[PDB]
Structure 1
């Protein structure tokens, strides 16, 4: 399940950090990075519990 949660958008344009960083400027790529970070952090916390 953990490995399958990496290919999730969580409300972003893509699930790959490289595509977001290549296509987009930092000040308005920060929001996509933030949504990805929140989703992955939640999944990791659930796994550990």
Structure 2
């Protein structure tokens, strides 16, 4: 998932953009993936209970 970023692969973001906006793109992707992982952990806790 692109999560609202231009590309879903990290090395493209590094190779194409400058740090000032590459950081924004990376931040968006990181928050998206952190949210996905947190959702997985929460459902795992419910199922474990």
With normalisation by structure 2, the TM-score equals 0.82
Aligned length: 42
Q: Whose relative contact order is higher, 1 or 2, with alpha carbons under 8 Å and at least 6 apart?
A: 1
Q: In terms of Rg, which structure is larger?
A: 2
What is the RMSD of the two structures over their aligned residues, measured on CA atoms?
0.5
Structure 1 unaligned blocks of 5 or more: 1-7
Higher helix share: 2
Structure 2 gaps of 5+ residues are 43-49
Runs of 4+ in 1 over 6 A off after TM superposition: none
